[PDB]
Design a protein around this ligand. Structure first.
Ligand SMILES: NC(=O)c1ccc[n+]([C@@H]2O[C@H](COP(=O)([O-])OP(=O)(O)OC[C@H]3O[C@@H](n4cnc5c(N)ncnc54)[C@H](O)[C@@H]3O)[C@@H](O)[C@H]2O)c1
Ligand SMILES: NC(=O)c1ccc[n+]([C@@H]2O[C@H](COP(=O)([O-])OP(=O)(O)OC[C@H]3O[C@@H](n4cnc5c(N)ncnc54)[C@H](O)[C@@H]3O)[C@@H](O)[C@H]2O)c1
Ligand SMILES: NC(=O)c1ccc[n+]([C@@H]2O[C@H](COP(=O)([O-])OP(=O)(O)OC[C@H]3O[C@@H](n4cnc5c(N)ncnc54)[C@H](O)[C@@H]3O)[C@@H](O)[C@H]2O)c1
Ligand SMILES: NC(=O)c1ccc[n+]([C@@H]2O[C@H](COP(=O)([O-])OP(=O)(O)OC[C@H]3O[C@@H](n4cnc5c(N)ncnc54)[C@H](O)[C@@H]3O)[C@@H](O)[C@H]2O)c1
Lengths: 341, 341, 341, 341
């Protein structure tokens, strides 16, 4: 029985547990523990009531067996007994006792090999850092691209970021068919939980500004991460991100120079075929004039807007949507499932 | 001559300093110190650029002397030199060296008599807590109502809340004229800084919810504060507050039972006359069809919308706007200037 | 069976059709025609993709048959074949040939007795105006309160408004138990389809102003409508509405003077009982600390927040949420289902 | 004095008349009439109260002199007396009698050479179409690029769109220095008046969706318009616009392939020099970490953000903000001021 734990019951952490229950196909592993710096009642409330994704279709009841707190969660013909912890320092967590095989590190505060190892010290056998690498990782993984490159010896793993999980497939596909000389990316991202409601002191002066009333351009970890996953693309791609006042969903605007003839038709035909043959698990395409909120609660790593494709000579722009929250949470579960044989 | 400090350079603290320069009349005191846990660069940036009230019209120079940091601010033909500090523990602040007559406590974290006295220990002669009292205050003041009841011996003072500054004049005016059996308050409030961008752990489960996408009912400190200012109204006034996704500006909806004949005409007439005589300093009245944005950057403590006044039988409702940041800020200055004679 | 038509395929019209498919229990009537001044392609897209309630879970195909446009919709193990019209003038619609028994009038534009009769003088046996009455009507019905009073002579019926469906029960339940001398209503409502995106010319100078950036007080049709269902409440209740920048869901504050002794406990116990017995189909009660987005897609006509119930003296206030789109659409279908004999 | 008139008192028309008063240098023509299909009381109300730009810092007085409605405006030590009209059809306007020299045609309705000439056959000597040309024009101008290229025989002029006036200088400057082979544009743009509060039928299926809750990709007239100004760029530039839920201010992201060596330093130094010489009136450069709301009420056509300049190989991105209302209203005044002798 593969045993997963979630460190950090936040936007991702919560949507991992939900996605475990909502998946059409039951996963061959169990979440047995969650740890957050917050009280079980706050976590249960936030788990049940979600501004972005709606009420949880199920029932959650708290029990105090031993001096241990459990969540009894019943949804979609599925049940789970989940231990709740409240330990800010991850080396003190009982991962030995609970027989934890994988830890989903979803706090954002423990992204260095050092900080992550603290879970291994605490008894976990493997750690997935649900964010970009800070210093070193054993592997950097985009599910549906290179998840078969995980070695059994590998203990610290990054599932990079959602922006990375969308950008890489696009770049792999386009570069393989046509050759990317160079490329530049603009991400139009919804508000994130680290921003400010009103103008407020913050380590980053741009993200200190009122989230609901501003367009805020800012840096992206997706490019550092993409270079780890695809080394040959070093010095051939940069980009940045823009926060705008919506609650969820993002897009990528990839502009690239092609190394061979391109048309709008051949680009869209290539992506449709890729989505049908090699990337069907994680990639879709739409021909409809849709907007961000139409992709809310979509499980795909990317959905391409074929009506947005543009070519002027050698230069081209493609455009893809993704649910930064749900897309990534599904990929976390997809990845965990991949370790079993 | 009189030397003021500001502890907490946020939406209140920053708009206090701005209001001092912008005031059409020069105040007789000077602001000579500011403290926040953030660095001077972050403080200057946020002081200059504001999502709500625009670019600061003036020059801000930072002087790093050997040990001390100062701001040299020049605006509207006035100049201030302002020592800048970064001390989380208010008792370690150099209020003695700097000869601080009044400290404005604008952090939200030092509302007890104990915590306010920490400024007194640091050397300050008087504290004004910029919030409702938590336990004991030597006086609880609404400028324009009972600001004369400040005794020269009084060392810890509360300037109550924005909401209170507006609610009290309404209750006083109406109670004096018609008599209030009881009243109930609904406040519609722009978002505040303590809220959450996305759904996130927080000690209020209602304010944990995404600020930009929800109507959020919640408690008001204004009711306990009113009972300190007007003790006769204990057991006769209750109310609550609603957060909605605007950036600034609030409204108060007050529903009361009159103890003598009321009409719409009579209520409006009384409110107009008070804004023209006894409350001309802090109170205004419009009959124009306005909306929240129109009161952005108004200094008045309340602006009555007379078109909204209603009466059925012995029950009536009135309505008033206020700029929750600017009005409050102005009334802190107005209070500090009342201490002198 | 009974044949229903929808005139005006907007927020209400579209959600009526959606709620027919989504209903747990199949309605014993069919929707056989829709009419809008817009092209079928615009209408199908908007039907399929909704910013507020998500993707339509089902398939929509367009057919041309003898110059007639039909929509074949399949969902929830149900199918409808729905003829599509584009006639701005109700008198020229084919209600006689389509054998329409009931027209849902959802345009906003035909609320007068005389305008609504244009559907009758085009072949329809009965018209439900999906709004408060303009002048007069044969009946004004709130489902769950007085749907049984519909007579066969009632050919023009008003289903009033969202706000009225929520208010009338509240006022009825509480008047019957404790007695209401008088009452005043404050509605907090999400933005509506008739507002302006930016400050623009408009009939109402308040709804002229930017929908996404303002608190906007405004009139409410609810009180006129309530007085037409409960004529004894003439002179005993008034109120108004406040638009705030959320996409959907509304709340009502009712402040009343009781005529007998009251406490918070007795009020909540009465409202829980009513939600369990007489009003169970249309009314719920929550004790949890929830926010607006938690009631998106709720079918209830009101959900009381009992944590919000206040009492001071003989004066009380109760608070209730409703999904202003989904509730109202479900009450329309529920009303039509009440006609079968 | 030269005599200007405004058809369409909207976001542009209103800001034109404001910009007249607020401008630091006095303009050497007068605005002597405005027309709109809304009544004068509405026009004055929207002119005095703005959700974006705040209260008009002046006085407006309506006078009736002989069945002629006039506005008497005072602000910034200046005066105007402006006749107000309410004429739906331009050929019926009294331009001959009022001796109109230029009409600022700011309705969005009369962009054809045919529809603009209706104002010529009604008495005016010259017309400026305040938008991209629909069919053809005597000249398409970007003030500060080709405004010297107006011939006195030109009667139908276009001042293109906001976006065109940020894009064209960028393209000109860069192409001239480094050579542009091809380029693609992304515009991030605040909501405009033509959008939808909620999902509503609309000519454009993207702009039909809720303006306040969506990222909305859409077309841009700027690429048509730029090719009328610079025909050599046919087939070499393309792009699109994204609407996000802010109220004002846009940004342009321009990706180009340079025909010669480029660095970030060299690009930034070119744009700085230009902003200090030939483009000083319309262009500025910042390297501060600012956000959209800091450029509200900036008179410039574009403010380049240095920190955003990226180069990879031969491909490069640049980014520039503009106030899509104020920048444009000021360039319309600047256009009229250039005509004189
Ligand atoms: N939200 C997205 O769209 C998205 C997508 C991909 C990756 N990520 C990454 O996921 C990480 C978390 O993001 P999020 O949106 O969930 O943030 P969040 O703030 O919603 O969640 C963080 C959680 O960590 C908890 N926490 C804080 N300190 C802790 C500690 N010492 N031990 C345990 N729990 C602790 C917080 O209480 C909170 O519940 C970040 O690195 C972010 O970059 C986010
Ligand atoms: N904003 C309003 O409308 C309003 C109106 C009336 C009263 N108040 C009250 O005023 C107070 C200030 O809140 P705000 O709106 O300015 O929010 P805010 O978060 O902007 O203000 C808090 C500020 O205090 C600083 N701070 C935190 N810990 C500190 C410490 N130990 N020492 C010094 N500075 C510290 C923060 O960095 C920040 O700048 C609160 O009590 C609030 O409830 C606010
Ligand atoms: N949305 C709510 O919360 C709510 C609740 C209760 C009642 N209502 C009422 O329902 C009515 C409709 O409001 P809505 O929110 O659906 O607005 P809406 O603008 O979304 O719906 C109006 C629809 O009518 C169409 N239309 C306009 N003129 C027409 C004509 N001559 N013939 C046919 N179709 C025409 C429009 O194209 C559009 O599809 C209004 O009276 C409103 O007060 C709305
Ligand atoms: N807002 C921007 O960012 C921006 C920038 C550049 C160009 N423009 C263009 O300027 C034009 C005006 O747009 P806006 O933003 O001012 O929109 P708007 O809808 O606010 O302005 C249109 C105005 O014209 C009035 N009107 C309508 N029909 C009329 C008629 N027949 N005669 C007279 N007046 C009539 C309307 O009542 C309204 O006052 C559009 O073509 C727009 O694309 C807008």
């Amino acid at each position: 029985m593969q045993r997963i734990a979630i460190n950090g019951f936040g936007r991702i952490g919560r949507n991992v547990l939900r996605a475990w229950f909502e998946s059409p196909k039951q996963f061959h592993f169990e979440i047995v523990a969650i740890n957050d710096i917050a009280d079980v009642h706050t976590l249960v409330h936030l788990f049940k009531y979600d501004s972005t994704h709606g009420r949880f279709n199920g029932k959650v009841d708290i029990t105090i067996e031993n001096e241990k707190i459990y969540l009894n969660i019943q949804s979609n013909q599925r049940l789970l007994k989940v231990e709740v912890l409240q330990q800010k320092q991850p080396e003190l967590l009982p991962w030995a006792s609970l027989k934890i095989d994988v830890v989903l590190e979803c706090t954002g505060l423990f992204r260095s090999h050092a900080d992550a190892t603290r879970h291994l010290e605490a008894g976990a056998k493997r750690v997935i850092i649900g964010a970009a690498p800070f210093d070193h990782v054993d592997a950097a993984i985009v599910y549906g691209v290179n998840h078969a490159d995980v070695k059994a010896t590998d203990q610290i793993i990054s599932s990079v970021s959602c922006t990375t999980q969308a950008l890489v497939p696009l770049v792999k596909i386009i570069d393989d068919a046509f050759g990317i000389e160079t490329a530049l990316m603009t991400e139009i991202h919804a508000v994130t939980a680290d921003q400010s409601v009103l103008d407020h002191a913050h380590r980053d002066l741009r993200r200190a500004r009122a989230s609901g009333q501003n367009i805020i351009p800012t840096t992206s970890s997706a490019l550092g991460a993409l270079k780890r996953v695809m080394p040959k693309m070093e010095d051939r791609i940069d980009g940045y991100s823009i926060r705008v006042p919506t609650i969820n969903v993002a897009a990528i605007d990839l502009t690239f120079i092609a190394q061979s003839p391109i048309t709008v038709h051949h680009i869209n035909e290539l992506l449709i075929k890729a989505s049908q043959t090699d990337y069907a698990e994680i990639m879709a395409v739409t021909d409809e004039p849709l907007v961000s909120s139409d992709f809310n609660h979509s499980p795909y790593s990317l959905i391409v807007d074929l009506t947005q494709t543009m070519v002027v000579g050698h230069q081209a722009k493609v455009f893809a949507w993704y649910d930064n929250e749900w897309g990534y949470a599904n990929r976390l579960l997809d990845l965990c499932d991949s370790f079993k044989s």
